[PDB]
């Protein structure tokens, strides 16, 4: 539900169960396992989803007035049509608080902003509305990324890299505020990702701007004929019965939903000494990467994302001070999908 803040306050009895959930080291996988209603294949990313479920940390910059580094969290899913990215995330539109669902060729750049035209209410025309500035902090499930004109997608550079807007038209001229996190379901110019041609070029984008992203946890068809039958039968029987069971996958009515909700507000991850120093040592070989012909490599924006991931995963477990394990799942998150182009 929505974000008034005042009309959503929870009782202490629910806090019992919330910190109960927090009392599971199983909680690292429980809510990611409670993401799907019934989908039981290779949820290994749903932990990577969940850092945006628990939608990011608030590293404010009311401190120095300088450099305004939000804990910017940006991840996209990309792969083949087999994956239910559109349908998963059509359902996740029925999850996200600021649920949006547009995609390539639903609305232009001005189809996202400045819906300007006549108004017979005033008997005059007016400067008027947009899309993103309504979705601050939110998400739009998005597909068919490689579909838009260059007019759009050079806006996204602006926001993804500054999270800003300053506008100039003949009528109103504006320097507004706009900022949020991604979900998307980009696709290539192909039907299947071409074997022996990485998404380094398969999806249609430039040389190191492809490299620029934090990490897009790759998707692709499961290359195994066998497992179809299991769920072709189980999740058709799901329809055949037209109801569920509260099995070990205990689907909470709302006990899941306030650990989502309440854990946006009263939490403030802090760093003492834990989740920083590993790559602050290992950067030797992490920046022996200067060598390479036409490649894309390691850069010193990675650790920014690492700290952000870290405070995110400390959001789960509610560790007011730093979590250290978050590093380990961060390194896992990386090198499960950073060796997709060793070539």
């Amino acid at each position: 539900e929505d974000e008034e803040g005042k009309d959503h306050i929870f009782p202490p009895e629910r806090v019992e169960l919330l910190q109960l959930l927090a009392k599971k080291p199983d909680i690292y996988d429980r809510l990611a396992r409670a993401i799907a209603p019934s989908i039981y294949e290779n949820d290994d990313i749903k932990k990577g989803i969940l850092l945006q479920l628990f939608g990011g940390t608030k590293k404010k910059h009311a401190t120095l007035g300088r450099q305004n580094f939000r804990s910017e969290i940006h991840l996209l899913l990309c792969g083949d049509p087999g994956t239910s990215k559109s349908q998963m995330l059509q359902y996740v539109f029925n999850l996200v608080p600021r649920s949006q669902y547009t995609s390539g060729r639903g609305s232009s750049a001005v189809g996202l902003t400045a819906y300007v035209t006549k108004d017979p209410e005033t008997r005059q025309l007016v400067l008027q509305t947009g899309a993103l500035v309504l979705a601050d902090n939110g998400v739009c499930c998005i597909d068919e990324f490689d579909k838009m004109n260059d007019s759009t997608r050079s806006v996204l550079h602006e926001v993804m890299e500054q999270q800003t807007l300053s506008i100039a038209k003949a009528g109103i001229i504006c320097q507004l505020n706009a900022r949020t996190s991604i979900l998307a379901a980009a696709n290539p110019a192909e039907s299947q990702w071409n074997k022996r041609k990485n998404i380094i070029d398969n999806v249609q984008l430039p040389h190191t701007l492809l490299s620029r992203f934090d990490l897009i946890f790759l998707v692709l068809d499961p290359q195994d004929e066998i497992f179809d039958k299991r769920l072709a039968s189980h999740l058709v029987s799901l329809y055949y019965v037209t109801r569920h069971e509260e099995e070990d996958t205990m689907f909470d009515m709302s006990v899941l939903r306030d650990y989502i909700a309440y854990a946006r507000e009263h939490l403030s991850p802090t760093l003492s000494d834990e989740a920083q120093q590993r790559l602050i040592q290992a950067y030797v070989d992490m920046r022996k990467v200067g060598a390479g012909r036409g490649q894309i490599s390691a850069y010193p924006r990675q650790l920014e994302s690492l700290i952000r991931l870290s405070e995110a995963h400390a959001k789960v477990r509610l560790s007011n001070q730093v979590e250290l394990l978050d590093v380990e799942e961060a390194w896992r998150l990386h090198r499960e999908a950073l060796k997709q182009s060793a070539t």
């Binding site: 929505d2 401190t63 040389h207």
Partner: protein, 628 residues
């Protein structure tokens, strides 16, 4: 009569502030004292002070205001009478403030009228001044016409019965535009609060009006705090209002107008906040109440002399605005000269002479060349930034129209173009199309530009400098081709830009770990930044002062900038065999204002040959930096 209590109330409010009002002092007599000579008739009054002395007339005020409002003007006149030999020319504009409650477009009913509430929103589709001669003189035709009465109502009616005679009571006299009562307003519209952005419904818009002193100080992109003078609107005709209709059918013994009223809104206070800067005579947080050229222009000389005297403050100030940053220490000293003044001569009708200088950044990827400038929009006034592809070539131009709204063709502004005496830098100078590029090819140098195809005698002008964002072909500085092929760009702009300062990347572990050692004091949430030498307030005030000086050259290096420049082109007599390069007098112009600004640092006039030598050093730096 009802409001005689309000009469006596503001009467004895005057009579109290006729004595002291605040510590033997009054806050609303010296505004009135400045009023007394021109008699402009605007004085804001603190709403708190009603609760201070009048003891909660707020609730005596904030409902029956619209009816009580006029009596405040009579009260005002009674104030001005007591000590000034007075005529009734006096009037009452008010720009109320010191009010707590802040409501929005939704709590609207029949019950919301005659209040003073403060409200914000946005500003859109503005509209112009349109005067009003609200009053005049009008009665029967013969002689008995001297009519300064109450005839100024919104609903206007020439027809009056009589004053002295039995005479015409529909046949009127003629009009007075000469010695009577007139005033002004405008009319604009407002969209829903961007601080209150719910789902579903539209941005419900309100009508808005402004009195005299409020005028032409509203503007697009701004939020406000109004009065709460919601209205019965003296409207004239409308459709769809098919409710019951009434009118007075008088006494039987032995004109018509359909009634459907609409809504608008009116207001008599503004604090256009988030749009307020103030130059240097404004007392800041840190001041020194002293005597000076002006009020506070440099009345902190008590320190600014010190901030203009050290031989260390150069490097200290180079380090007093990059606490969270570490890189080379050449742009950290050069880039400020872009923000720092130039030449400012006082000279002939030859042609416009320029003060500003072109400025560049190039570097390898992920070097925080952006973070140099991401802050600069938050830093300087007039100088707001976005990208060039952040808009179209309705960045330079306006949005080109081919439909009829007012006269069917409108390109009269832009986005680069409204940066008058601030810079609006841009990123990504390499892949942008060659339209604004060739526009800038002269718009930076010959800051007097024109267009065709829609021109209302097109003559526009750039005003400030620039910041560049190049990156090489391969993403790396692989020394496998010449610079002219390393960037694949043109000559004259590589000479128009008299200052390059490229930021090259390497791999040495101590560097990167030293950066993470910066990070040691980036999230230590107490002490997440490094020490400094000079607070920002004094910094910008010294900057705001150091221009007003008339910089000068009479120096033998001014005489023998011929010598240093002759050597400049002596050593650059080559730069022609191995990958030839070009020298040009824009370089001299740039060095000139560069040396001049370098002495403007000194809070002093009158250039010194030290500045020439450092400028020569820096030009040598840039040109040998251009060497492959």
């Amino acid at each position: 009569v009802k409001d005689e209590v309000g009469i006596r109330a503001q009467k004895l409010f005057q009579d109290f502030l006729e004595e002291f009002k605040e510590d033997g002092e009054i806050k609303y007599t010296r505004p009135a004292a400045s009023l007394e000579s021109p008699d402009r008739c605007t004085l804001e009054v603190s709403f708190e002070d009603v609760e201070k002395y009048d003891q909660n007339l707020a609730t005596a005020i904030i409902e029956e205001y619209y009816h009580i409002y006029p009596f405040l003007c009579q009260s005002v006149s009674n104030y001005v009478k007591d000590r000034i030999g007075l005529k009734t020319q006096k009037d009452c504009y008010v720009a109320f403030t010191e009010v707590p409650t802040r409501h929005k477009v939704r709590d609207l009913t029949t019950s919301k009228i005659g209040t003073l509430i403060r409200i914000s929103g946005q500003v859109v589709r503005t509209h112009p001044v349109h005067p009003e001669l609200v009053s005049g003189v009008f009665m029967c035709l013969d002689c008995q016409t001297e009519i300064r009465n109450v005839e100024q109502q919104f609903k206007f009616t020439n027809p009056t019965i009589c004053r002295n005679p039995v005479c015409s009571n529909r046949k009127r006299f003629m009009l007075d535009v000469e010695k009577s009562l007139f005033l002004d307003f405008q009319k604009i519209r407002i969209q829903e609060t961007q601080a209150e952005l719910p789902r579903g419904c539209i941005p419900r818009a309100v009508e808005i009006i402004l009195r005299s002193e409020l005028v032409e100080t509203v503007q697009a992109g701004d939020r406000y705090d109004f009065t709460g003078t919601l209205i019965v609107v003296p409207d004239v005709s409308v459709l769809a209002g098919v409710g019951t209709r009434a009118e007075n059918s008088s006494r039987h013994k032995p004109g018509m107008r359909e009634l459907n009223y609409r809504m608008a809104f009116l207001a008599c206070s503004v604090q256009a906040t988030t749009a307020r800067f103030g130059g240097t005579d404004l007392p800041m947080s840190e001041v020194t109440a002293e005597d000076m050229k002006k009020q506070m222009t440099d009345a902190e000389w008590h320190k600014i002399y010190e901030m203009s005297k050290d031989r260390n403050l150069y490097q200290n100030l180079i380090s007093s605005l990059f606490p969270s940053i570490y890189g080379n220490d050449e742009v950290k000293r050069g880039i400020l000269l872009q923000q720092f003044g130039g030449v400012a001569k006082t000279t002939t009708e030859k042609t416009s002479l320029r003060g500003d200088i072109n400025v560049c950044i190039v570097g390898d990827p992920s070097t925080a060349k952006s973070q140099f400038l991401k802050q600069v929009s938050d830093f300087s006034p007039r100088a707001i930034y976005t990208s060039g592809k952040a808009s179209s070539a309705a960045g330079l131009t306006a949005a080109v129209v081919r439909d009829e709204e007012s006269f069917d063709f409108v390109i009269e502004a832009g986005a680069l173009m409204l940066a008058d005496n601030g810079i609006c830098c841009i990123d990504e100078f390499d892949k942008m199309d060659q339209r604004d590029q060739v526009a800038i090819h002269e718009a930076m140098e010959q800051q007097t530009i024109s267009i065709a195809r829609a021109g209302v005698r097109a003559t526009l002008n750039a005003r400030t400098s620039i910041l560049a964002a190049a990156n090489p072909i391969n993403g790396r500085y692989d020394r496998s081709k010449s610079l002219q092929q390393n960037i694949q760009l043109s000559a004259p702009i590589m000479s128009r830009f008299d200052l390059f300062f490229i930021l090259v990347d390497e791999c040495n572990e101590v560097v990167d770990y030293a950066i993470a050692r910066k990070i040691v004091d980036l999230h230590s949430n107490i002490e997440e930044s490094v020490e400094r030498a000079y607070t920002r307030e004094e910094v910008l005030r010294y900057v705001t002062f150091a221009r007003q000086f008339k910089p000068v050259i009479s120096q033998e290096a001014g005489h023998m900038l011929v010598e240093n420049y002759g050597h400049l082109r002596q050593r650059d007599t080559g730069t022609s065999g191995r990958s030839t390069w070009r020298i040009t007098v824009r370089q001299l112009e740039s060095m000139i204002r560069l040396s001049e600004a370098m002495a403007k640092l000194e809070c002093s006039n009158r250039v010194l040959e030290r500045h020439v030598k450092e400028a020569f050093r820096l030009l040598n730096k840039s040109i040998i930096r251009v060497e492959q």
